[PDB]
């Protein structure tokens, strides 16, 4: 299999002019300075950019590129996108269960894994965890071996590496490339780009393309690249790396001067006479949701210190509120206490949902490369990770608050009023978490969104009803009291709990209330805050929250759907 | 001047064994892998580590190292520690104002700087801003040119660069090193270390020391370093970097095998016969506090988007609280609103002072390198930057919250109560800021301290008196209500504001209160919260916060004083 590209004018600003060449099965290479097209000609030939900038044609063996080009070729990201909490056996099963056909047996699927991991020489680390901040794992020299094998699953004809040596040691990098040249003799074409190689690296290549500042400066065999620049009018001294010598000519021991020398080359015409010789989903839905939710759940178990910690904080802050507010008294101070803790329990659900920004932001570079390669659909990605991360880690702490503080404080001692409180803190937990997915989706930085979640809640906190009284806001602001998540929770806990209570000892007020301005029953507190007494007035909040969940997750759906994928 | 070191055994685990060599005036370089001693031999010879680990001697021209060695030598950090928001003219005046004595004239000191900046060739950027993220500044190839001149102010004989090429471009670094060889012929003994140089770099050296894994593996003239290893048993091919060839030996084309080869050298024996021939504050306190506070004040004005922003945040949020709580009524809802806004103001002062963690953490490596260089005292650093950054950026928002909302809300319209509220928000802003310096100072990460500031406030917030009633906590938790900064401000604001008020319209209650459980006056709200009515009870809160400033800044001082400076 060979590539052949011709007359590409890529723009966003044309940062490419006209680049020509074939790529034989061997060791194709792209060298140059980081400002040039060493990372942009690669993404064009790997179909990773916008096709609107594309001008020329990219042909395979006489055939132009189909839409099956991505599923028939492997691209490997510069940094590792591997699941550092899964083992290499687990990741290669995950890649196999989403890319290969469903007709294959697991006994067929395991052997295809077993050939690859032996081809990578990874039998000694075959069940070792890869490595996280909190788990000692396999060294960085074989994380790169893992990621290449993730794209060796389909056994493609064409491989795309992006900087396979940047980030490793020099003794590490030769071990990677010697493995690659052994792949090159098997018939798999390898296309990569190295930042500043060594002569021990450069002695192994089979074809070289030297790019700088959007101009093709060399194309041909890498052995004849040094002798070309000897015949170009330069001299390479003794004991010098030729790859350093190639970038030495770039910076002046000028760009358009050196390109025109390449125009009059015998290597250019041989490329020119060759390019005219040639010129003239897979898997169903429910299967995708099974393996994706399986993956993120082991990620949730495999990183305990981000998930156990939210349980421990919930228990400890559960007990302290249980200790401070120990059994509440039906006296004049009872209204201040009961409306205090219910304001603390609702707002605790909101501000602890700022950690849900971490959900799609850290997974973003993994989300993009898996979707362009097409392991799943976006609708299948979204319903899985909601089921795996968001759904259990919010059901748990809302029960832990509910089990601890309810009978220590001594709230309304009925059957349903225990469960209505439990259900309410569950709903307000999702709604604040859904707003986090509404904002944090698509962005790549954490601190801008983590700021912005803090901004939105402290305005929602004002209108909740404890700081300001919601009946006496000026009328051109009292429509903002509908846009706040914590109001609907805090109203529901107030409606659940202040019904049959009394707060003036010695004074039966629920038949007649002489001497008013008194607030001697729960209703007179509950009306003065502007809250309905009907049983609809309870459940009006829950349908108000549930509508906010569906809207915010839809916004969370579409922002992943319309993202700049290229 | 010459260095000479002999028989160094440094420990923390002995990651150095026995290293011997002199460093003549010329260009002294240290190569090797990053795990070896290329970063730790430099810190020993520049007196930057603990002398409790050091064993061998360091001699200079026949004399051991005095206490004046940290002031008569220049050490240059790897990354830039320069004030990126100032200019190069102002930075070199800052280094001159704290190292040269007070005898010299400003005419004398500026000519010395003109000697430097003409020698560095920075005439075209002599009055240009250096560079931040928010300011387009001088290029990274000349920030390094700026920082080296900061140590050239005393015109020292001995220079210590730490990786002067790492981070620059390859064509960028040749401009730096050719300057250094032009510095070398002035007679300045230049000592540094390079992560993997180039042969265009390596041809400029004068003396070379190869270290790996705590063992001296070569030390001599850099010209013969290639010729020594051909006699060792290794062959260097043509078109190969000699510097990369040296680390190729380290990784095996073993450590103790190659080390004893160097002990039996003809070069080690010439070195061994050389050592035995040789062997056998500055400025007043008031002057320092000017220039430290002067530099950081320009840093405050030179970064608008971190300082002008908090003015904008103050005014905008100040208008919103002015809009929601527009003029407060003296009715039954009036108590809930007035205690609502006053709770929002005191916690807005506390929770926004988490930004003070940025103060001592970002400037930490500049603080450490300067104090070893001894530009100032730790007493002088700490009193200056508080006078420069913390003092004005907390006086401003407490006035703007005071000026805007006090007449939109229509609080108690007397002369003093405007200023008692103004003073109260200022102290609680300092008290929370002092706690932030009490935690942040000494740590190097932002996020761990920022999370710990977040946990400390939400427990202080419960005890403030709005959520729980303070007089009904059980008595074995009620001792905790004194540790809480938002209690003291909020207690003071409630005392400033509920004194001469009434809240049952039509009902004079201040002579007699019939029909109790009423809260018909400001005292009855104020006593039921557990707050004194005597004018001591107000100011008790201010002398409480004034003590918490003095305690926390002291803890902040001692953590800076007892820091591991090495």
């Amino acid at each position, epitope marked *: 299999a060979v590539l052949s590209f011709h007359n590409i004018c890529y723009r966003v600003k044309e940062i490419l002019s006209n680049i020509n060449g074939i790529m034989k099965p061997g060791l194709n290479a792209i060298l140059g300075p980081t400002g040039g097209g060493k990372s942009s000609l690669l993404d064009v030939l790997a179909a990773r950019k916008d096709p609107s900038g594309l001008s020329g044609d990219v042909l395979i063996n006489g055939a132009p590129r189909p839409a099956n080009f991505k599923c028939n070729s492997g691209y490997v990201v510069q940094d590792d996108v591997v699941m550092g909490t899964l083992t290499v056996r687990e990741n290669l099963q995950f890649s196999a269960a989403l890319r290969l056909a469903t007709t294959m047996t697991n006994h067929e699927k395991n052997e295809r894994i077993n050939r690859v991991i032996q081809e990578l020489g990874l039998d000694k680390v075959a069940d070792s965890k890869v490595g996280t901040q909190f788990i000692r794992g396999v060294s960085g020299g074989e994380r790169k071996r893992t990621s290449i094998g993730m794209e060796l699953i389909t056994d493609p004809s064409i491989l795309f590496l992006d900087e396979p040596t940047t980030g490793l040691d020099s003794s590490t990098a030769n071990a990677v490339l010697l493995l690659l040249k052994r792949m090159s003799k098997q018939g798999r074409t390898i296309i990569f780009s190295i930042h500043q190689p060594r002569y021990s690296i450069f002695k192994l290549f089979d074809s070289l393309t030297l790019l700088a500042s959007g101009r093709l400066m060399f194309h041909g065999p890498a052995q004849e690249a040094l002798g070309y620049f000897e015949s170009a009018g330069y001299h390479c001294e003794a004991y010098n790396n030729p790859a350093d010598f190639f970038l030495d000519i770039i910076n002046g021991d000028l760009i358009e001067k050196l390109a025109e020398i390449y125009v009059n080359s015998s290597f250019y015409k041989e490329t020119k006479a060759e390019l005219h010789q040639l010129s003239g989903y897979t898997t169903s839905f429910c299967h995708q949701l099974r393996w994706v939710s399986k993956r993120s759940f082991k990620n949730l178990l495999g990183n305990p210190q981000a998930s156990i910690a939210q349980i421990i904080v919930t228990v400890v802050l559960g007990l302290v509120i249980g200790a401070i507010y120990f059994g509440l008294k039906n006296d004049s101070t009872g209204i201040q206490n009961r409306a205090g803790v219910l304001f603390f329990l609702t707002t605790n659900q909101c501000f602890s949902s700022v950690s849900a920004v971490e959900l799609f932001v850290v997974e973003k570079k993994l989300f993009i490369h898996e979707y362009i390669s097409g392991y799943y659909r976006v609708s299948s990605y979204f319903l899985g990770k909601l089921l795996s991360d968001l759904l259990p880690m919010r059901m748990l702490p809302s029960i832990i608050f509910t089990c601890i503080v309810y009978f220590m404080l001594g709230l309304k001692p009925k059957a349903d009023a225990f469960f209505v409180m439990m259900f309410t803190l569950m709903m307000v937990a999702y709604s604040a978490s859904s707003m986090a997915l509404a904002i944090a989706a698509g962005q790549s930085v954490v601190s801008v969104a983590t700021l912005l979640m803090t901004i939105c809640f402290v305005f929602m906190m004002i209108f909740s009803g404890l700081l300001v009284n919601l009946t006496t806001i000026a009328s051109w602001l009292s429509w903002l009291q509908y846009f706040s998540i914590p109001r609907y929770g805090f109203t529901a806990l107030q409606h659940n709990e202040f019904l049959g209570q009394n707060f003036c000892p010695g004074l039966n007020a629920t*038949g*007649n209330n*002489p*001497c008013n301005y008194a607030t001697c029953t729960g209703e007179e507190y509950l*009306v003065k805050q502007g809250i309905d*007494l009907s049983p609809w007035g309870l459940w009006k909040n829950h349908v108000a929250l549930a509508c906010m969940i569906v809207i915010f997750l839809t916004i969370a759906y579409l922002k992943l759907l319309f993202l700049k994928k290229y | 001047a010459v260095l000479s070191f002999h028989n160094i055994c440094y420990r923390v685990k002995e990651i150095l064994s026995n290293i011997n060599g002199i460093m003549k005036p010329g260009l002294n370089a240290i190569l090797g892998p990053t795990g070896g001693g290329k970063s730790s031999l430099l810190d020993v010879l520049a007196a930057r580590k603990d002398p409790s680990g050091l064993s061998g001697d360091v001699l200079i021209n026949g004399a051991p190292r005095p206490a004046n060695f940290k002031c008569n030598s220049g050490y240059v950090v790897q990354d830039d520690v320069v004030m990126g928001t100032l200019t190069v003219r102002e930075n070199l005046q800052f280094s001159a104002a704290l190292r040269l004595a007070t005898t010299m004239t400003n005419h004398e000191k500026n000519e010395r700087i003109n000697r430097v900046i003409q020698e560095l060739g920075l005439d075209k950027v002599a009055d240009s801003k250096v560079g931040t993220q928010f300011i387009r500044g001088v290029s990274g190839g000349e920030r390094k040119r700026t920082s080296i001149g900061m140590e050239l102010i005393t015109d020292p004989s001995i220079l210590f660069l730490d990786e002067p090429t790492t981070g620059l471009d390859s064509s960028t670094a040749n401009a730096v090193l050719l300057l250094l060889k032009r510095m070398s012929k002035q007679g300045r003994t230049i000592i540094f270390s390079i992560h993997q140089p180039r042969y265009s770099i390596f041809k400029l050296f004068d003396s070379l020391t190869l270290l790996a894994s705590g063992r001296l593996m070569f030390h001599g003239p850099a010209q013969e370093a290639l010729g020594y290893f051909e006699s060792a048993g290794y062959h260097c091919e043509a078109y190969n970097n000699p510097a990369d060839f040296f680390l190729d030996i380290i990784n095996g084309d073993l450590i103790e095998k190659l080390a004893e080869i160097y002990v039996n050298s003809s070069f080690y024996k010439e070195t061994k016969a050389e050592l035995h021939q040789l062997s056998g504050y500055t400025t007043s306190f008031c002057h320092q506090l000017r220039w430290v506070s002067k530099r950081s004040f320009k840093n405050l004005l030179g970064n608008p988007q971190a300082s002008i922003a908090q003015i904008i945040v103050t005014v905008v949020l100040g208008l919103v609280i002015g809009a929601i709580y527009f003029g407060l009524k003296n*009715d039954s809802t009036g108590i809930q609103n007035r205690a609502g806004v006053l709770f929002f103001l005191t916690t807005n002062q506390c929770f926004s002072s988490v930004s003070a963690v940025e103060l001592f953490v970002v400037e930490k490596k500049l603080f450490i390198h300067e104090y070893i260089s001894g530009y100032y005292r730790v007493s002088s650093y700490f009193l200056g930057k508080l006078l420069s950054d913390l003092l004005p950026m907390r006086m401003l928002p407490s006035i703007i919250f005071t000026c805007i909302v006090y007449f939109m809300l229509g609080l108690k319209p007397k002369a003093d109560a405007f200023f008692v509220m103004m003073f109260t928000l200022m102290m609680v802003a300092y008290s929370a800021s002092s706690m932030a310096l009490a935690i942040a100072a000494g740590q190097s990460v932002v996020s761990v301290a920022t999370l710990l500031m977040t946990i400390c406030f939400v427990f202080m917030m419960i005890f403030s008196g709005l959520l729980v009633n303070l007089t009904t906590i059980a008595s074995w938790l009620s001792w905790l209500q004194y540790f809480s900064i938002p209690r003291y401000g909020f207690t003071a604001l409630q005392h400033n504001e509920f004194l001469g008020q009434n809240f049952c*319209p*039509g009902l*004079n209650a201040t002579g007699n209160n019939p029909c109790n459980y009423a809260t018909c006056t400001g005292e009855e709200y104020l006593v039921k919260q557990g707050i004194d009515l005597s004018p001591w009870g107000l100011w008790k809160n201010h002398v409480a916060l004034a003590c918490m400033i003095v305690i926390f800044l002291t803890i902040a001082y001692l953590k800076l004083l007892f820091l591991k400076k090495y």
Partner: antibody
Amino acid sequence: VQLQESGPGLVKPSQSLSLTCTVTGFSITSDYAWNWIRQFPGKKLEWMGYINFDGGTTYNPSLRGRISITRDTSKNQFFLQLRSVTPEDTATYYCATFYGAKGTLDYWGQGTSVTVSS
Amino acid sequence: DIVLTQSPSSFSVSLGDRVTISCKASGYILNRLAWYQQKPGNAPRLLISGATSLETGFPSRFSGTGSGKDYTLSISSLQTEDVGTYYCQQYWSTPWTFGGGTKLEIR
């Protein structure tokens, strides 16, 4: 306990309106709130606004800016001052008394009638 | 605000008859309701405070039994001097609206 209105029984349109209720038998700075109630023909009563015992006041938001209530504590009087009058509110005006802790309009004036024509 | 409603805007009763006047609110009042009796040519005089209690100066033929939103007033065996006009008042919020008022008659 004992209230009595007094004022002009006729006024030009768009000029002014002034009434005066002189409380005897009690001191108006002592206990109560004091308020004004008007009653249109085709009887629909309508509350206007009160002044507190300590000079504070609260007005009906239907009558924005048109009404202001002041008092003279020297002789137990409190004044209704209604401006920019329309010929629609040719009502019967009352000064009344609000206990606060009982919550009802306990005492009511004799009542005067104001007509706005030309 | 809180608007009030006396949907029986009139009656036509006989002497000694038990009549009942309903007053409907546009919100919760929580027994903060009143009743006034206006003869033709006088000021309104308070009849019932707090929707249950009664004022000194009236016989115990008047009684109010209110709960939640539906407040009512019952006159059992009305005399001749009970003809007139009746009003209901909320004093929960600040713009103290009254009811539209009803006017008893004799056939």
